[PDB]
Write a protein that holds these residues in place. Structure first.
Motif, PDB file in Angstrom:
ATOM      1  N   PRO A 105      52.372  34.788  16.084  1.00 36.23           N
ATOM      2  CA  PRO A 105      50.962  34.368  16.009  1.00 36.23           C
ATOM      3  C   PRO A 105      50.630  33.127  16.820  1.00 36.23           C
ATOM      4  O   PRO A 105      49.443  32.857  17.026  1.00 36.23           O
ATOM      5  N   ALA A 106      51.618  32.383  17.302  1.00 36.89           N
ATOM      6  CA  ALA A 106      51.355  31.217  18.129  1.00 36.89           C
ATOM      7  C   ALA A 106      51.561  31.470  19.612  1.00 36.89           C
ATOM      8  O   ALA A 106      50.971  30.764  20.433  1.00 36.89           O
ATOM      9  N   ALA A 107      52.380  32.454  19.981  1.00 40.33           N
ATOM     10  CA  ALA A 107      52.557  32.781  21.388  1.00 40.33           C
ATOM     11  C   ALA A 107      51.407  33.595  21.944  1.00 40.33           C
ATOM     12  O   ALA A 107      51.174  33.566  23.155  1.00 40.33           O
ATOM     13  N   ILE A 108      50.688  34.318  21.093  1.00 37.47           N
ATOM     14  CA  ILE A 108      49.527  35.056  21.564  1.00 37.47           C
ATOM     15  C   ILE A 108      48.363  34.109  21.818  1.00 37.47           C
ATOM     16  O   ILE A 108      47.620  34.276  22.789  1.00 37.47           O
ATOM     17  N   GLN A 109      48.208  33.088  20.973  1.00 38.07           N
ATOM     18  CA  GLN A 109      47.124  32.126  21.141  1.00 38.07           C
ATOM     19  C   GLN A 109      47.286  31.308  22.407  1.00 38.07           C
ATOM     20  O   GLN A 109      46.293  30.959  23.050  1.00 38.07           O
ATOM     21  N   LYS A 110      48.527  30.997  22.777  1.00 36.56           N
ATOM     22  CA  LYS A 110      48.773  30.228  23.987  1.00 36.56           C
ATOM     23  C   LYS A 110      48.476  31.051  25.230  1.00 36.56           C
ATOM     24  O   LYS A 110      47.930  30.537  26.210  1.00 36.56           O
ATOM     25  N   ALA A 111      48.820  32.335  25.203  1.00 37.55           N
ATOM     26  CA  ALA A 111      48.568  33.191  26.347  1.00 37.55           C
ATOM     27  C   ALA A 111      47.098  33.525  26.502  1.00 37.55           C
ATOM     28  O   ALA A 111      46.663  33.837  27.613  1.00 37.55           O
ATOM     29  N   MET A 112      46.325  33.480  25.418  1.00 35.61           N
ATOM     30  CA  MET A 112      44.894  33.718  25.542  1.00 35.61           C
ATOM     31  C   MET A 112      44.196  32.565  26.235  1.00 35.61           C
ATOM     32  O   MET A 112      43.245  32.787  26.990  1.00 35.61           O
ATOM     33  N   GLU A 113      44.654  31.336  25.996  1.00 35.01           N
ATOM     34  CA  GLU A 113      43.989  30.173  26.568  1.00 35.01           C
ATOM     35  C   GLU A 113      44.201  30.102  28.074  1.00 35.01           C
ATOM     36  O   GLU A 113      43.283  29.748  28.817  1.00 35.01           O
ATOM     37  N   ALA A 114      45.396  30.442  28.547  1.00 34.74           N
ATOM     38  CA  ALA A 114      45.626  30.412  29.982  1.00 34.74           C
ATOM     39  C   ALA A 114      44.977  31.580  30.696  1.00 34.74           C
ATOM     40  O   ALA A 114      44.884  31.555  31.926  1.00 34.74           O
ATOM     41  N   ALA A 115      44.540  32.602  29.968  1.00 34.47           N
ATOM     42  CA  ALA A 115      43.864  33.718  30.608  1.00 34.47           C
ATOM     43  C   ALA A 115      42.470  33.319  31.061  1.00 34.47           C
ATOM     44  O   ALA A 115      42.088  33.557  32.211  1.00 34.47           O
ATOM     45  N   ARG A 116      41.713  32.652  30.189  1.00 36.64           N
ATOM     46  CA  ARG A 116      40.360  32.226  30.515  1.00 36.64           C
ATOM     47  C   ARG A 116      40.324  30.929  31.306  1.00 36.64           C
ATOM     48  O   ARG A 116      39.291  30.257  31.342  1.00 36.64           O
ATOM     49  N   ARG A 117      41.440  30.553  31.907  1.00 34.22           N
ATOM     50  CA  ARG A 117      41.475  29.667  33.051  1.00 34.22           C
ATOM     51  C   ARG A 117      42.066  30.451  34.214  1.00 34.22           C
ATOM     52  O   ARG A 117      42.899  31.340  34.008  1.00 34.22           O
ATOM     53  N   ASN A 118      41.589  30.144  35.427  1.00 35.82           N
ATOM     54  CA  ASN A 118      41.981  30.804  36.680  1.00 35.82           C
ATOM     55  C   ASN A 118      41.700  32.313  36.636  1.00 35.82           C
ATOM     56  O   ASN A 118      42.601  33.150  36.604  1.00 35.82           O
ATOM     57  N   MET A 119      40.410  32.629  36.614  1.00 34.71           N
ATOM     58  CA  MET A 119      39.930  33.996  36.508  1.00 34.71           C
ATOM     59  C   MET A 119      39.558  34.543  37.890  1.00 34.71           C
ATOM     60  O   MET A 119      39.612  33.841  38.901  1.00 34.71           O
ATOM     61  N   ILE A 120      39.173  35.821  37.926  1.00 34.06           N
ATOM     62  CA  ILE A 120      38.924  36.555  39.165  1.00 34.06           C
ATOM     63  C   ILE A 120      37.577  37.256  39.046  1.00 34.06           C
ATOM     64  O   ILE A 120      37.295  37.882  38.020  1.00 34.06           O
ATOM     65  N   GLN A 121      36.746  37.147  40.079  1.00 35.56           N
ATOM     66  CA  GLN A 121      35.519  37.928  40.182  1.00 35.56           C
ATOM     67  C   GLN A 121      35.789  39.210  40.966  1.00 35.56           C
ATOM     68  O   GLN A 121      36.237  39.155  42.116  1.00 35.56           O
ATOM     69  N   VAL A 122      35.496  40.356  40.357  1.00 36.65           N
ATOM     70  CA  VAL A 122      35.777  41.669  40.929  1.00 36.65           C
ATOM     71  C   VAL A 122      34.453  42.354  41.241  1.00 36.65           C
ATOM     72  O   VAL A 122      33.559  42.400  40.389  1.00 36.65           O
ATOM     73  N   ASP A 123      34.328  42.883  42.455  1.00 40.96           N
ATOM     74  CA  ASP A 123      33.062  43.437  42.933  1.00 40.96           C
ATOM     75  C   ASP A 123      33.070  44.959  42.807  1.00 40.96           C
ATOM     76  O   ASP A 123      33.162  45.698  43.786  1.00 40.96           O
ATOM     77  N   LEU A 124      32.939  45.425  41.571  1.00 37.78           N
ATOM     78  CA  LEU A 124      32.970  46.856  41.312  1.00 37.78           C
ATOM     79  C   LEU A 124      31.651  47.517  41.694  1.00 37.78           C
ATOM     80  O   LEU A 124      30.591  46.887  41.702  1.00 37.78           O
ATOM     81  N   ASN A 125      31.731  48.811  42.011  1.00 37.83           N
ATOM     82  CA  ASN A 125      30.577  49.621  42.386  1.00 37.83           C
ATOM     83  C   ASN A 125      29.763  50.070  41.178  1.00 37.83           C
ATOM     84  O   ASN A 125      28.672  50.621  41.345  1.00 37.83           O
ATOM     85  N   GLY A 126      30.263  49.844  39.972  1.00 36.45           N
ATOM     86  CA  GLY A 126      29.638  50.329  38.764  1.00 36.45           C
ATOM     87  C   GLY A 126      30.478  51.446  38.194  1.00 36.45           C
ATOM     88  O   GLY A 126      30.356  52.602  38.610  1.00 36.45           O
ATOM     89  N   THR A 127      31.352  51.092  37.247  1.00 32.49           N
ATOM     90  CA  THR A 127      32.332  51.941  36.566  1.00 32.49           C
ATOM     91  C   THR A 127      33.295  52.662  37.508  1.00 32.49           C
ATOM     92  O   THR A 127      33.990  53.586  37.073  1.00 32.49           O
ATOM     93  N   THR A 128      33.363  52.274  38.780  1.00 32.58           N
ATOM     94  CA  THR A 128      34.226  52.906  39.770  1.00 32.58           C
ATOM     95  C   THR A 128      34.797  51.813  40.657  1.00 32.58           C
ATOM     96  O   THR A 128      34.714  50.622  40.352  1.00 32.58           O
ATOM     97  N   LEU A 129      35.361  52.230  41.776  1.00 33.07           N
ATOM     98  CA  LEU A 129      35.848  51.342  42.811  1.00 33.07           C
ATOM     99  C   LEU A 129      35.047  51.582  44.081  1.00 33.07           C
ATOM    100  O   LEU A 129      34.178  52.450  44.138  1.00 33.07           O
ATOM    101  N   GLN A 130      35.359  50.810  45.115  1.00 36.28           N
ATOM    102  CA  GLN A 130      34.678  50.994  46.387  1.00 36.28           C
ATOM    103  C   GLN A 130      35.334  52.058  47.257  1.00 36.28           C
ATOM    104  O   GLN A 130      34.638  52.910  47.816  1.00 36.28           O
ATOM    105  N   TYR A 131      36.657  52.031  47.375  1.00 39.91           N
ATOM    106  CA  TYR A 131      37.380  52.922  48.268  1.00 39.91           C
ATOM    107  C   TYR A 131      38.821  53.028  47.787  1.00 39.91           C
ATOM    108  O   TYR A 131      39.278  52.180  47.018  1.00 39.91           O
ATOM    109  N   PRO A 132      39.545  54.078  48.185  1.00 37.30           N
ATOM    110  CA  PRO A 132      40.980  54.143  47.876  1.00 37.30           C
ATOM    111  C   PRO A 132      41.751  53.038  48.579  1.00 37.30           C
ATOM    112  O   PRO A 132      41.629  52.855  49.789  1.00 37.30           O
ATOM    113  N   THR A 133      42.545  52.303  47.810  1.00 39.26           N
ATOM    114  CA  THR A 133      43.364  51.228  48.339  1.00 39.26           C
ATOM    115  C   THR A 133      44.775  51.359  47.795  1.00 39.26           C
ATOM    116  O   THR A 133      45.054  52.190  46.930  1.00 39.26           O
ATOM    117  N   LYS A 134      45.669  50.514  48.301  1.00 36.30           N
ATOM    118  CA  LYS A 134      47.071  50.577  47.904  1.00 36.30           C
ATOM    119  C   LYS A 134      47.694  49.210  48.132  1.00 36.30           C
ATOM    120  O   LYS A 134      47.792  48.762  49.275  1.00 36.30           O
TER     121      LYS A 134
END
Length: 156
Positions: A48-77
């Motif tokens: 119960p204490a290792a999950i709380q620590k990992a949640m806090e570091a998640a909502r720091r250093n986040m990523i903005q993702v430019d989705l097309n709306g419930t899909t992706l833009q193109y096939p990538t790899k």
RNA sequence: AACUGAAGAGUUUGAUCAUGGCUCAGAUUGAACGCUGGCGGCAGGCCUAACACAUGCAAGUCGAGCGGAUAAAGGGAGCUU
């Protein structure tokens, strides 16, 4: 914001002398349901204490993702480590069909139609890097067209 | 009238990453076996000894091709049914 989702839990150890000291690690991705995600890894001495620590570091250093709306833009790899990942957008009725640790990324981003597969070594702490090189390097064409749109997007 | 899919897990270690085997989740069969057993449609039923076979039946038909012999009805007569 905050929608949490756990993936992995381990039992790492450490030999000192006498006995062997245990410790728990955890991996938890946090997204917003619109295209802003963030993963996090924490180590502590109990579940119960290792999950709380990992949640806090998640909502720091986040990523903005430019989705097309419930899909992706193109096939990538994309790839990281000895792990190779393939993703390509799909139709409407098909949900997300991916394995274990790419579902948890692709739920909280808000996408619904992802049609993915991972090759190589399946490491749940390392297929996530292979996913976030892919999504953080999308383009979302700011162009006048697509079949015509290669005179105003290439200058972007 | 033309027309769309792709999932992973367990197991080498005091613990970790990798390479690499093994094993399970699926859909299928001219299938066999064990337990159990109401109904009807539509299907299928010697994959082994191309190993021997009792007994039945599975290719005959034309008298508007020709001989021959069976000779009706009837025509009868006769003699007494």
């Amino acid at each position: 914001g905050y929608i949490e989702k756990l993936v992995q839990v381990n039992r790492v150890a450490k030999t000192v002398k006498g006995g062997r000291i245990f410790a728990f690690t955890a991996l938890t991705v946090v997204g917003d349901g619109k295209g802003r995600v963030g993963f996090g890894r924490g180590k502590a001495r109990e579940v119960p204490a290792a999950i709380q620590k990992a949640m806090e570091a998640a909502r720091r250093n986040m990523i903005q993702v430019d989705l097309n709306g419930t899909t992706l833009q193109y096939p990538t790899k994309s790839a990281h480590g000895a792990s190779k990942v393939y993703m390509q957008p799909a139709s409407e009725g098909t949900g997300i069909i991916a394995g274990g640790a790419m579902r948890a990324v692709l739920e909280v981003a808000g996408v619904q139609n992802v049609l993915a597969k991972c090759y190589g070594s399946t490491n749940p702490v390392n297929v996530v890097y292979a996913t976030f090189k892919g999504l953080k390097n999308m383009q979302a064409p700011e162009a006048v067209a697509a079949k015509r749109g290669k005179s105003v997007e290439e200058i972007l």
